[PDB]
Motif scaffolding. Sequence first.
Motif, PDB file in Angstrom:
ATOM      1  N   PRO A  12       1.408  -1.006   0.099  1.00 56.11           N
ATOM      2  CA  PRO A  12       0.438   0.117   0.355  1.00 56.11           C
ATOM      3  C   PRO A  12       0.555   1.454   0.456  1.00 56.11           C
ATOM      4  O   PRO A  12       2.060   1.287  -0.184  1.00 56.11           O
ATOM      5  N   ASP A  14       0.517   5.390   0.710  1.00 50.57           N
ATOM      6  CA  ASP A  14      -0.649   6.676   0.916  1.00 50.57           C
ATOM      7  C   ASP A  14       0.917   8.186   1.424  1.00 50.57           C
ATOM      8  O   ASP A  14       1.539   8.016   0.780  1.00 50.57           O
ATOM      9  N   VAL A  83       2.726   7.469   9.878  1.00 49.87           N
ATOM     10  CA  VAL A  83       1.545   7.190   9.840  1.00 49.87           C
ATOM     11  C   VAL A  83       1.002   8.350  10.433  1.00 49.87           C
ATOM     12  O   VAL A  83       1.525   9.102  11.129  1.00 49.87           O
ATOM     13  N   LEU A  95       7.467   5.045  12.148  1.00 46.31           N
ATOM     14  CA  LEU A  95       7.370   3.346  11.676  1.00 46.31           C
ATOM     15  C   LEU A  95       9.134   3.422  12.463  1.00 46.31           C
ATOM     16  O   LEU A  95       9.687   3.747  11.842  1.00 46.31           O
ATOM     17  N   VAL A  99       9.251  -2.768   6.636  1.00 47.10           N
ATOM     18  CA  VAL A  99       7.333  -3.017   6.472  1.00 47.10           C
ATOM     19  C   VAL A  99       6.846  -3.110   4.942  1.00 47.10           C
ATOM     20  O   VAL A  99       7.567  -2.348   3.862  1.00 47.10           O
ATOM     21  N   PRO A 100       6.255  -4.732   4.568  1.00 43.89           N
ATOM     22  CA  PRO A 100       6.550  -5.007   3.347  1.00 43.89           C
ATOM     23  C   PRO A 100       5.534  -4.242   2.286  1.00 43.89           C
ATOM     24  O   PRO A 100       3.951  -3.802   3.304  1.00 43.89           O
TER      25      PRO A 100
ATOM     26  N   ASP C  27      -6.361   5.092   8.566  1.00 39.35           N
ATOM     27  CA  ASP C  27      -6.373   3.987   7.737  1.00 39.35           C
ATOM     28  C   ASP C  27      -5.211   4.190   7.130  1.00 39.35           C
ATOM     29  O   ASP C  27      -4.392   5.828   6.579  1.00 39.35           O
ATOM     30  N   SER C  28      -3.633   3.753   7.380  1.00 42.05           N
ATOM     31  CA  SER C  28      -2.545   3.776   7.342  1.00 42.05           C
ATOM     32  C   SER C  28      -1.560   3.161   5.898  1.00 42.05           C
ATOM     33  O   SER C  28      -1.767   1.341   6.297  1.00 42.05           O
ATOM     34  N   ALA C  29      -0.732   3.181   5.262  1.00 46.83           N
ATOM     35  CA  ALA C  29      -0.011   2.290   4.073  1.00 46.83           C
ATOM     36  C   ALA C  29       0.760   1.338   5.804  1.00 46.83           C
ATOM     37  O   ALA C  29       0.785  -0.215   5.852  1.00 46.83           O
ATOM     38  N   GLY C  30       1.415   2.366   6.368  1.00 47.34           N
ATOM     39  CA  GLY C  30       2.236   1.924   7.444  1.00 47.34           C
ATOM     40  C   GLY C  30       1.676   0.477   8.389  1.00 47.34           C
ATOM     41  O   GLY C  30       1.942  -0.411   9.170  1.00 47.34           O
ATOM     42  N   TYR C  31      -0.148   0.912   8.982  1.00 53.09           N
ATOM     43  CA  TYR C  31      -0.466  -0.349   9.188  1.00 53.09           C
ATOM     44  C   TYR C  31      -0.671  -0.933   9.031  1.00 53.09           C
ATOM     45  O   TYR C  31      -0.676  -2.201   9.710  1.00 53.09           O
ATOM     46  N   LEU C  32      -1.015  -0.581   7.821  1.00 49.63           N
ATOM     47  CA  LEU C  32      -1.411  -2.503   6.882  1.00 49.63           C
ATOM     48  C   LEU C  32      -0.486  -3.101   7.148  1.00 49.63           C
ATOM     49  O   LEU C  32      -0.847  -4.281   6.842  1.00 49.63           O
ATOM     50  N   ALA C  33       1.013  -2.761   6.549  1.00 49.27           N
ATOM     51  CA  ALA C  33       1.778  -2.978   6.693  1.00 49.27           C
ATOM     52  C   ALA C  33       2.423  -3.903   7.221  1.00 49.27           C
ATOM     53  O   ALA C  33       2.666  -4.895   7.275  1.00 49.27           O
ATOM     54  N   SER C  34       2.735  -3.269   8.326  1.00 51.26           N
ATOM     55  CA  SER C  34       3.199  -3.417   9.695  1.00 51.26           C
ATOM     56  C   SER C  34       2.036  -4.688  10.593  1.00 51.26           C
ATOM     57  O   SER C  34       2.191  -4.828  11.196  1.00 51.26           O
ATOM     58  N   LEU C  35       0.642  -4.745   9.983  1.00 51.47           N
ATOM     59  CA  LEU C  35      -0.460  -5.664  10.517  1.00 51.47           C
ATOM     60  C   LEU C  35      -0.179  -6.580  10.094  1.00 51.47           C
ATOM     61  O   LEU C  35       0.000  -7.989  11.006  1.00 51.47           O
TER      62      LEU C  35
END
Lengths: 442, 442, 442, 16
Positions: A12, A14, A83, A95, A99-100, C27-35
Motif C-alpha cells: 500500500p 499513502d 503514519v 515507524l 514493513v512490506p 487508515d495508513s499504509a504503514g499500519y496495514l503493512a506492519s499488521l
Amino acid sequence: ADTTIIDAVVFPQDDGTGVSNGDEDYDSAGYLASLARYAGDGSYVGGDSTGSPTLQFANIDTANEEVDIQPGHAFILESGHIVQSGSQKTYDTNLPDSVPYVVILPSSVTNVPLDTDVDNDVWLAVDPTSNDSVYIRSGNGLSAPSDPSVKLGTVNSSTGSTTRPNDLADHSVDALNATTIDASDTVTGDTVDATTTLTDAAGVSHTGELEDINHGSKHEDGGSDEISVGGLSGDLADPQDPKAHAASHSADSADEISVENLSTTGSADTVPISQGDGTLSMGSIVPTDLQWREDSNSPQTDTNVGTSTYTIADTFDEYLIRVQVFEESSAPGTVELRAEGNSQSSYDYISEDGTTTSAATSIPCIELQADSSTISVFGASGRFSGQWEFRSQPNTSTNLATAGFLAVISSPLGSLELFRAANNFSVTWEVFGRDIGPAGVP
Amino acid sequence: ADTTIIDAVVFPQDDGTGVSNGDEDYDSAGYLASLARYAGDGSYVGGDSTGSPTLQFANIDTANEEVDIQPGHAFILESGHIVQSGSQKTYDTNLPDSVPYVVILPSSVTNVPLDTDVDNDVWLAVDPTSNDSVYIRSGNGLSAPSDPSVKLGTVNSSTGSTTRPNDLADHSVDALNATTIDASDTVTGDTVDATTTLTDAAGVSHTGELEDINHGSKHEDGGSDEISVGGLSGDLADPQDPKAHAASHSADSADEISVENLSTTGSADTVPISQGDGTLSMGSIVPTDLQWREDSNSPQTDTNVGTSTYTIADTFDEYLIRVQVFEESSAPGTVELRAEGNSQSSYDYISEDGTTTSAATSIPCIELQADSSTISVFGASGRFSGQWEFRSQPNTSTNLATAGFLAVISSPLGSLELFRAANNFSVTWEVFGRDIGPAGVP
Amino acid sequence: ADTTIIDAVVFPQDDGTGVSNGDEDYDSAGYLASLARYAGDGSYVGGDSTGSPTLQFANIDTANEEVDIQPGHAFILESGHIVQSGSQKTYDTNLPDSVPYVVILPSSVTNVPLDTDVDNDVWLAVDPTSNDSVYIRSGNGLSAPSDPSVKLGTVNSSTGSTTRPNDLADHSVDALNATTIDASDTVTGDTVDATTTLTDAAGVSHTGELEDINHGSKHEDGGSDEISVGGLSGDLADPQDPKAHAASHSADSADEISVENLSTTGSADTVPISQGDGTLSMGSIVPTDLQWREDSNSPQTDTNVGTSTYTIADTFDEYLIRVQVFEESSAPGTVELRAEGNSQSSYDYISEDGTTTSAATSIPCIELQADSSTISVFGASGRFSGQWEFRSQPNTSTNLATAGFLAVISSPLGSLELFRAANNFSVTWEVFGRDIGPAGVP
Amino acid sequence: PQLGDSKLGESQLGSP
Ligand SMILES: [Mg+2]
Ligand SMILES: [Mg+2]
Ligand SMILES: [Mg+2]
Ligand SMILES: [Mg+2]
Ligand SMILES: [Mg+2]
Ligand SMILES: [Mg+2]
Ligand SMILES: [Mg+2]
Ligand SMILES: [Mg+2]
Ligand SMILES: [Mg+2]
Ligand SMILES: [Zn+2]
Ligand SMILES: [Zn+2]
C-alpha cells in the motif's frame, strides 16, 4: 538499468509513503488479501497456492541476451514510512521497523535485456513516487537499485545457468509445533531427539540405543554383549591351555616324541624298568662278563647212535660243549669221542690217571664214559672232566648223564662226531662260543 | 448439498470480487485483524491462540445422521479477483495468483445432516455473490463445491470415525530459524546434523561418533578398539600354540602317553640307557647264554657241624654247587658228603686217581676236601673239580677254601647232607640251576 | 504499575473495539503493512528484517531500578471484538476467536522503574479505550495487566539478570516444507528420517546403516562381520586344540617330560626294547646269576718270557683266570706257576695223580702244561681243570692252548708270575671276579 | 476510498 513496467502494481501507499497527496492507492479486496499473505521476516519472492515460487525465469535466450519473467508476486520491505497517530489526520509518526509492500505482476515480462555472454544480476525495483512505478535492473555485476528492491535472481548469458536465493521466505520463530517437517537440505540442532524411531540413509529404522566408538569394553568376558569364539581363525599372541592330546604323540602320528629325545634324571647306565603298578623307575640291568653265546641248540637222537654233528657252528675261538644222555642200561659204555680226521690234526688223549693213550688216523681210544670210570680227554681240542652213571632207579630211568667239555680253535672250525655199539642211547647237546684270539689280541 | 448459514461472514469482498457495485463489505478492525492472521500457502482451518485448530466436530449422532460444528475461522483461497490499478477507481487489473478470504463462524452449527450409516465428505463453501453467502456440502462421496471451498473433514455416520487433512496450515519456506522444533510425526531431511547431542528412542544421549556396520575390521590386534580375549568361550578353528604342559602327561594324570606308544629310531634290541647328563641314548644290553639262576642263597654255619641242607631247591635239570669254607686246622680233613639215601639211588664214587671207590647203604668214601690231597666225587649225582687246603697263614686263618661241583636230576629233586667230626667247621654255599631236560628236548 | 507511553500507537481500532465513535483510527499504509507482518499463533515480540527480536532491554541500572527499552513492535491478541455483518454499518457480530493488535513503539523508553534489589516482571498493556492508549506494568511479582498484554520479559534489579519468553513467534502448522532448518536448541520428532546423511556431534557423516546394542551376535563365525583373532591376547576359558609341539618336550628344551614320569602297561621288570621299524615294545632283559666281572684284560707277550703280572685284580673273593698261549715247538714244557713268595703263604701242590709235590721258600714244581700230561694244580690258592697240547697243524702255528684255573683270597689280593725256558713264548689272559666272603655271609 | 481519507470502519472498501 531500467525497464519501466507498464502494468505492475504496488500496495500500500499513502502521503506517509513516497506519493504526492492526490496519489494515494485506492483500496481493493485483492490488495488486502495479497498483503495478508505475507509470512517471512525479510524480502522474498512469494509462493503460489501449491507452494511453488513465482516470478520464475523462462525462455533464457543465452548470448542473445533476452529472458522471460512469469507473473506472480513478491514482498519488498521498506523503512521510513510515516503514519497518522490515532484520530489525527496529520501524518506524524515514524515507524521503527521496515514493513512490506506487495509487488503484483499480472503479465509475463517478455525478452528482458541482459549483457552479452556473461553473468548478470537481476533486481526488481519499486520507485516510491507513484501508485505503480516499478522497474528492473540487469547487467554484468551492475549495481542493485538504491530503491526498495529484491534480488529476483542471477542469469548467466553465456552458460544459461540460473540461481535465485530470495525465492521463498526466510522465517524466524521461537517454537515450531508441526505434524511433519521435510527439509530439502539440512536439518540442524544442538539436540536431535528421535523419540520412537531414527531412520538412517540406508533406510534401517532403529529404536534400541545406538553404538559409540570404543565399545570394545563390552565384547569381553563378563561384559554385556559377550561373543563366542567358536569357529574363528587366527593364533593368540599368548599360548593357550592345551586340550587332551597325549595320543597324538605316538610312534607314527602327527606328533612324534622319540624316546632318545626325552629327559631322565637317572644315573649313567640306568634303564627305565616297569615296576608293574603302571609306573616306570630307573633301575640298572647288569649283564655278566665271561659271555658265552649259542649257535645250534643241538638235535635230539633216540633209540639210535647219536646223529653227531651237534655243532656246525660259526667260528668262536673257544667252544663249550655240554651233554645230556639217556641210556642203554643193558649195554652202557663209551660216548665215543674218537671223532675222525678233522680239518686240523690236534688231539690229546690223556685220561683220569693213565697219563698216556694211543693214536691213529682215526682215533683208537678217546672215550667219554657212560660209567663213572678212569676215562677222560685232555688236549688242544678236548679238555674234559668227570664221569656219570647209567641208572637212577637201579634198572632204568631217563634222569641220567651230563658232562661239560671244551675245545679251542686249532682248526678255524670243527664239527664233532660220536658212536655207541649198543645203539640205544638218547641224547641232547648244548654248545656255546667264547672269543679270545690265538695270540696277543682277543 | 446446501445449508445456508444464517450468521457466517466472509471478508474481504468488493466490486472486484463477485459482489454487486453497492454490496461491498463494510470495513471493520476485526476483519483486518483476523485476515492478518493468515500464514500458510494453501487453504486451511485456522488455529486458536493456543495453537489448536478451530471449526471442530462435536456430537456425532452416528446413524441418525446429524453432527455439530463449533465456531472458529478458516482461510479459503480464490483466484481471478480484480483490483484498481493505483489511483484509477475503475476495477481494471487481474491478480496473477490465488489469494485468501477469511471465513468467520460466530455460532456453533447444530445437527448438520449426513447420509445414513456410511462415510461422508464435509466441505465449507463461499458463494461470491453476497457479503456473507456461505453454505456447507455433505454426502456419501457427493461432489465437492465448485465454488471456493475447503475440505473441512470427513465423518462416517456408521462408525463415528473422523479425519480432517486441512485442519492446519501447510507452510513452505526457504530457511527456518527456530529455538525448538517439535513434530508429532516425521522429521525428514536430506541431511540431519546433530551438533552437540543426538538422542535415540531409548533416551540415550550420544556425543561421540556412532558405529557403522562392518566395524569388525577394528576389533583385531593393532586396530583401534582391540578386544581382550581372556575368559571367552569356544574353540578356535585353527589349533593354537600350546602352553607349558610337560607334567600333564604323567603316569596317572589327565594326559597319559605310555612309553610303548612312543617312537624310537634305534635298531632292533636297543634300549634307552641314561648317559648320565640328563639324556637317554639307544644302546644295547646283551645278557649271556649259558644262564644259571639261584634258588636259596645257602645258610651260614660256624663253630658247629654244617647245617647241611644248604639247598632244598626247586626242580632244575642241573644244579651248580659252590662252597666257601673256614676250617678246623687242629683237626681238618674229611668233608663227608654223606648225602644219605636221597629220593632216588643214583650215585657214583670215583676218586681223583683211585679209579674205583667203596659204596654202602650210606656213603662210606665220598668227600669234598679240607686238605688238597687226593679225593673226588664222580657220578650222575656229583661231578667234582678239584681240592682245597685248610690254611692261609700256616697255623690258622678264615681265608681258606672253595670248590665247584654239580649234579643232574636223577631224583627230580635233592637236598645235600654233610658232616665233620672236628666240629669247628664254618661255611657258606651257593647253588644255581640250569635247564636241559633228561631226554631229547631241554 | 503505570507508564502511560506518550507516543506509542495501536492498530486497528473501531466502534467494534474499545473506542468511542469519535475515536476510530485513521487508515495508513504503514499500519496495514506492519499488521500484515503478523505470522505466529499467539502474542509475541516482532522480529526485525534480519530476524532479530525487537523491543530489547538495554542499560539495566541494577539496584537503582531503571531500564531502557529500544523501539520496535509486538503483537497482542484480544478477544471479543465486534464487526459489521456484510453491508450493515451496525457493528453487530461477535468474533469467535482472539485477533491481533500491532503495538508500535517509535521511541526508546528511558529509565523505566523497577523495584529495588529483586526480581521484576515487565508487561506491555494496551488500554482498549483510546486510539493510542498504552501503559507498562513492572514490579516485584506485581500483578500482570488485566488488559490485553504481553510478558515483555523479566529483569532482576539485584543481579542484572534478564530473560524473556515471548520474544519471537510461537507457530503451529501442519506440514512444513523447507530448504534448510536450524534449531538453536532441540529438534524433536516421533520419527527422525535422515535420507542421504546423518552427522553426529563428533562431526562424522554416516550414509551406511548404524549399529544397535547387542550386535555381538554378528561377530562370531558364520555371521556377517566376522573378526580374525590373529594377534589378540589372553587365555580362553576353554582349553584349545594344541598345535604341533612334540619336539618341545625334549631333554633340555622348555617342556621336559622325564621317562620315569611316564606310564607303562608292562609287567614288572619289563623294559622298552626297540623292535626296529620304529615301535618300542615291553620285553624283558634277564641278566644271569653266577656273575663274573673283569679287572684288567691281560697284556700280550710274544717272542719273550711271559711279562707275568698278567692281571692285578681288585679284592673279589674268587678269581677265574683263563689263558691263551703260543710257543716254539723246539722247546715246549711248563707254563711255570711256581710263582714267588706271595703276600700270604697259602699253597697246595697236588698234580694229577701224583698226590704230592716238593715245597720250598719259592715253589719247586707247580706247573701248567704245554703238552697234555700229569701236570696239574690243586690248593687253597690254585684249582685247575686240565691240560692242552703242543700242536695245531703239525708244524709251528698260533692256535695251541687254553686253560681255566681259579683262586680264593688267601691274601686279600695277588698277581701271578710265570717263566718259560724256550723264551719264544706268547700269551693272552682273561681274569674275572666272583664274590663270596670267607665266612658265613657273601 | 483512498487510504488516509477515511477513519477506519466507517466506509465500504472500493467505489461507486
Ligand atoms: Mg493524502
Ligand atoms: Mg520471451
Ligand atoms: Mg500503489
Ligand atoms: Mg462479509
Ligand atoms: Mg459501491
Ligand atoms: Mg447435539
Ligand atoms: Mg464508528
Ligand atoms: Mg536509560
Ligand atoms: Mg489505534
Ligand atoms: Zn563390535
Ligand atoms: Zn604334549
